[PDB]
């Protein structure tokens, strides 16, 4: 019927002054753009069809052509930046925002989807969608006593589009827009659909990725315990963005980090630090590295939760990028920890997996490890036990490697090592 029209046939019907021929031609254009087999986005654009599609969005008297244009434009906006720019250049933003109040839920849903694709392109279009006044009608669609009465796919599209209004960093979304959206985000964070939960956490993940004031706007809304609960979720699409958000929050002030510990996050880390998906282990160890960069009482909480053996674990065997975050976790630990805490580090066996990693080519990880070794040695003198550490480092071939690195031609590995030898190995 309307399957596999030529682009020229589609133009001939859209350029007719017959509304029904235009509807059929527009649906044919929609089916063309619905191919996952390289839809002819460009050819549709070069034919000048976007202004006609945008103008059909306002044909309230003929809701089907509103739906087919919304669908067709959605897919054009789903492509490259230039393809998205063409949809915006045709004036689609104010027309799509008008469709948010449509009495047909399937047209409203499509306009939600389309604005999500436009806002998803980047900061500028995201802020343009906001300036056109999209947030109020979007949030109004969620002003219900119970979210579960909304259609499941409708809710998912709304959450996803809201997710994109929080996304991207240069610049971050407007402060007043984030405050406007956050209460609805907080509610969606408590919904039972895992797709809504994942995209809700992704949204929180975006908002917490910035300076501490942005972190505070989220932390002040009380979402931290719920984030820690979603951290132990079964569905990996939920754990990943929940972990990025928790890890983002512990990049802030010690007080903001403490609320994450207070919510019980450290209890889930034995699983996270051994998780099979390599990216979870990297994110979890990076987060641990930023917790060990905190106060001594916070370092002590890492100790109480039995997480130091798990750091010895990731330092001994893991993806290399995970091992480098483990090195950072150790060095931050030894930079702010007490002498008793640094001695406890030795007794779970940090020293040998630390020295085996001096074998890496990565120049920055060598500075981190050498820095940690120095800090441990500094605690060894306050206990008057520097030699027993040297005997330890020599029996695992560490001293064998520490003075071999003096012939490294980055030249702080040059000297930080040579100091290490002529102060503790002479």
């Amino acid at each position: 019927g309307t399957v596999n029209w030529s682009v020229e046939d589609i133009v001939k019907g859209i350029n007719s002054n017959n509304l029904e021929s235009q509807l059929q031609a527009t649906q044919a254009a929609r089916k063309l753009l619905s191919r996952e087999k390289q839809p002819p986005i460009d050819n549709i654009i070069r034919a000048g069809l976007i202004p006609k599609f945008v103008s059909f969005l306002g044909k309230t008297d003929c809701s089907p052509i509103q739906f087919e244009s919304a669908w067709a434009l959605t897919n054009i906006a789903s492509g490259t930046s230039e393809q998205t720019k063409a949809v915006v250049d045709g004036g689609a933003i104010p027309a799509f925002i008008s469709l948010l109040a449509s009495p047909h839920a399937h047209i409203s849903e499509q306009a939600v989807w389309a604005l999500g694709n436009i806002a998803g392109d980047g900061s500028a279009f995201r802020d343009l969608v906001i300036k056109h006044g999209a947030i109020d009608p979007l949030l109004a669609l969620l002003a219900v006593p119970d979210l579960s009465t909304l259609a499941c796919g409708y809710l998912r599209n709304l959450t996803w589009t809201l997710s994109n209004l929080c996304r991207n960093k240069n610049p971050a979304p407007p402060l007043d827009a984030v405050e406007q959206i956050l209460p609805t985000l907080v509610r969606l964070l408590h919904h039972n659909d895992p797709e809504v939960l994942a995209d809700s956490c992704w949204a929180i993940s975006y908002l917490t990725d910035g300076p501490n004031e942005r972190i505070e706007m989220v932390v002040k809304k009380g979402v931290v315990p719920q984030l820690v609960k979603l951290l132990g979720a079964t569905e990996l699409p939920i754990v990943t963005p929940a972990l990025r958000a928790i890890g983002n929050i512990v990049t802030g002030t010690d007080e903001q980090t403490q609320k994450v510990i207070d919510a019980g996050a450290l209890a889930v880390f034995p699983s996270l630090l051994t998780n099979p998906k390599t990216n979870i282990q990297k994110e979890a160890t990076w987060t641990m590295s930023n917790i060990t960069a905190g106060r001594q009482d916070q370092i002590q909480q890492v100790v109480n939760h039995g997480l130091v053996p798990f750091l010895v674990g990731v330092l001994s065997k893991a993806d290399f990028k995970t091992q480098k975050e483990a090195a950072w976790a150790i060095t931050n630990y030894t930079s702010g920890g007490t002498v008793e805490q640094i001695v406890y580090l030795v007794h779970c066996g940090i020293i040998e997996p630390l020295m085996n990693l001096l074998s890496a080519k990565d120049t920055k990880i060598i500075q981190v490890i050498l820095d940690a070794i120095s800090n441990i040695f500094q605690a060894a003198e306050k206990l008057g036990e520097t030699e027993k550490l040297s005997i330890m480092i020599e029996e695992c071939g560490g001293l064998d490697k520490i003075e071999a690195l003096q012939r490294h031609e980055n030249e702080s590995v040059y000297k930080a090592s040579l100091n290490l030898i002529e102060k503790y190995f002479s």
Partner: peptide, 10 residues
């Protein structure tokens, strides 16, 4: 993040 944009194929 997850995908910046989404195509509708149905």
């Amino acid at each position: 993040s997850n995908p910046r944009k989404r195509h509708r194929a149905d």
